[PDB]
């Protein structure tokens, strides 16, 4: 009932890419769905770099609906260990057989040791709030809702890379992806999907907090994060260890349980959820944001270290009501 599902493929490069149709006749791209940004980015045939040609570049000159901006524009965005640069235009998009017209987006013209030489990047569907927009005034999701008034203003993520059942849902939730009830956390500022965080314990060790702190739900980041000061204390109590696929469950049996405190809601992260196997070793799926950015004082919750265990729901606040993030135990299989 007004809730369509977008299957998310888990690529070898740790990406969770969906499907997005651009232009008319439509051209298929496989972007990531990122609550950590808001711009809509598409890799285009204007980018002649090696990391671009390896993917199915969108050709704007073969689309009847492409509308380049009247004025030449250039947008440069940082994307991890790399950067994205390009122009601005409008296009018709189709997501899950739902159309969005007159949508502003960035045309990747350059991707210049580079993160793009390791992934098959084809674009970004930003799901953050409009204040983070630098390409356009109306966000893709808001524009999708306005042109499809039958949809409830919410989306959710089910992350299950084991059986390739990961799914991005628009318009609501489905009991087939979570167990129990959904706990709603109010968003403190409509910019990131950011909520209050009362504390963090690794076992009995207090990691957070000494200042009033916040968590950010960031589907575009695989690891969880902590500020640099707290990351040092985390790694002092959570070690890496030699691991194989045949003993990782034994190695991690008595690792510490991580507790995130959201008021009265206690969110547990188990060792097999925040630890990952990498090069014959169990390593924690945690990192600090060493690059100066707007997120370096928050606690990011990512796809691998959080969303594998918890079904996440994102509700856009209507009128004065604030937006909220919902969390529930994901259902296996
Ligand atoms: C898109 O813009 C055109 C003008 O170029 C306008 O005629 C049309 O109604 C717009 N469509 C939507 C869905 O806003």
Residue numbers in the entry: 198 to 309, 316 to 536
Reproduce text from the manuscript describing this model:
Modifications to the P1 biaryl region of the IPF scaffold differentially modulated inhibition of both plasmepsin V and X. Notably, analogs with potent plasmepsin X inhibitory activity successfully blocked the growth of Plasmodium falciparum in vitro.
